């Protein structure tokens, strides 16, 4: 599995794929539908800071299948309970949402934002997404059972939780398939080493393993707020390796075969601390601009978008500057203007999209990695239109598949 879990991007995306945009703004929920016919549709009136008073700052909201036919489904981690609106396959959903389960949640589990973390995963292989919670104990399943049937939580594991020192400010935790059978493991950049865990395929996970002495805060001076960390197949076999944007620029650690790690290696010098890259300022990514499908780099710098391609093996040509644009000069800021790096085309080569100042602004892929000119998709999801980052989410995410 190519699926990939992380903090930053917890709904993924599929390659190939025509990614559609949700948001989740002040009266409710509105789709994108990637399309020849581009507008805005409410869908749900819910999951909304004014739609039933829906918080950044308490509750998490996100896009998953949670059935088993390839469409996503609304899920919100709410006040009381798990609250889903699944899809009605036609850019409509149930509306009002069903609460699934009395837990995870802010007044159900004790659940905070600011303490841990939940996400929506297949981690069993069903074709549904289980609730997979980093608790204060450990990490916490509850086994999706077919028809928004959704099993008492579990413990999967007594580790990455808040007892065993897990810190949204100093660590980072990620669900990836490191072994190659399909089943997504925990890799965590705890405190000293970046350990993982093996998935035994019943929500369950076999105790963690140390297997990088660096890429963390006490081992190699890794931030937060500095050094990016991201967990993608970068050589092309479904199996998920390392990539930290460090001081110099690139490092990586490239998975054995079977989820043991290589060496830390500066693979790039460049969209590193020296080579001027601030979390402050931009955005820095890791996806398949090409038809090796594999790991190469995006990051949006002052000046605009700079592509490095990957080889195929891990190593990375020359950066380049694709276009003058969803950069720090031209007004793209972090805290304002989300921006992803996703197919929206379909070719298996993803695309741009910003939710910019006053509009939706996207740029495709050519194909090779290399990119056509800016589009203005539409004057909706965006800050002329109220949408913050402290009262609504945005995502792209493939409503359809
Ligand atoms: C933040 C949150 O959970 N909001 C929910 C809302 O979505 C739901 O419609 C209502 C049902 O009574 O309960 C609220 O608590
Ligand atoms: C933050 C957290 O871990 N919350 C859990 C809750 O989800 C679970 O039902 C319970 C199991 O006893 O323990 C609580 O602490
Ligand atoms: C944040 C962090 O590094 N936590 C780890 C924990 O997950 C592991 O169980 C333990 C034993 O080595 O070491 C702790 O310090
Ligand atoms: C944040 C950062 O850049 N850390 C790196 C560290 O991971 C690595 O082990 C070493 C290699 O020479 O250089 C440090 O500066
Ligand atoms: C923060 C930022 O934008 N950094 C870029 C850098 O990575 C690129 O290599 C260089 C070459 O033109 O231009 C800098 O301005
Ligand atoms: C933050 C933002 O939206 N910046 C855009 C810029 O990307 C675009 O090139 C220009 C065209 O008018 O308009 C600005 O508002
Ligand atoms: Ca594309």
């Known amino acids: 599995s190519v699926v990939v879990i992380s903090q930053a991007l917890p709904v993924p995306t599929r390659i190939p794929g025509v990614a559609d945009l949700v948001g989740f703004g ?19 009136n819910n999951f909304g800071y004014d739609a039933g008073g829906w918080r950044v700052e308490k509750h998490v ?5 949670t059935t088993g036919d390839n469409q996503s489904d609304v899920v919100g981690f709410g006040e009381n309970g798990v609250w889903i609106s699944t899809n009605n396959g036609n850019n409509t959903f149930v509306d009002p949402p069903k609460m699934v389960l009395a837990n995870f949640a802010y007044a159900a589990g004790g659940w905070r934002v600011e303490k841990h973390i939940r996400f929506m995963a297949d981690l069993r292989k069903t074709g549904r997404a289980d609730i997979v919670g980093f608790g204060d104990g450990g990490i916490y399943i509850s086994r999706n059972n077919g028809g928004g ?21 100093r660590h980072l935790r990620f669900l990836a398939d490191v072994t190659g059978d399909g089943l ?3 890799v965590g950049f705890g405190e000293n080493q970046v350990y993982i865990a093996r998935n035994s395929g019943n929500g369950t996970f076999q105790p963690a393993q140390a297997v990088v002495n660096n890429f963390c805060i006490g081992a190699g001076g890794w931030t937060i707020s500095a050094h990016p960390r991201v967990v993608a197949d970068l050589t092309g076999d479904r199996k998920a390796d390392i990539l930290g944007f460090g001081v110099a620029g690139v490092y990586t650690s490239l998975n054995n075969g079977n989820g043991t ?21 931009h955005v820095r990514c890791v996806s398949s601009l090409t038809n090796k499908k594999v790991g190469d780099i995006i990051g949006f710098g002052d000046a605009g978008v700079y592509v490095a391609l990957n080889n195929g093996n891990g190593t990375f040509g020359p950066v380049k500057r694709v276009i003058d644009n969803f950069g720090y000069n031209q007004g793209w800021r972090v805290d304002k203007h989300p921006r992803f790096v996703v197919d929206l085309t379909g070719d298996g080569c993803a695309d741009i999209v910003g939710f910019g100042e006053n509009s939706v602004w996207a740029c495709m892929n050519k194909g090779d990695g290399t990119f056509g000119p800016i589009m203005k998709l539409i004057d909706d999801m965006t800050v002329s239109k109220g949408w913050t980052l402290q009262k609504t989410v945005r995502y792209a995410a493939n409503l359809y598949l």
């Open 261 to 281: 790690f290589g060496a830390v290696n500066l693979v790039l010098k460049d969209f590193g601390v020296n080579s001027g890259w601030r979390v402050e300022k």
């Open 184 to 186: 997504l493991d925990v």
């Open 149 to 169: 049937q959704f099993a008492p939580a579990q413990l999967a594991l007594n580790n990455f939780g808040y007892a065993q020192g897990w810190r949204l400010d």
């Open 61 to 65: 909201r996100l896009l998953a299948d």
């Open 26 to 44: 002040n009266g409710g929920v509105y789709i994108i539908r990637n399309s020849l016919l581009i507008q805005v549709v409410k869908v749900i």
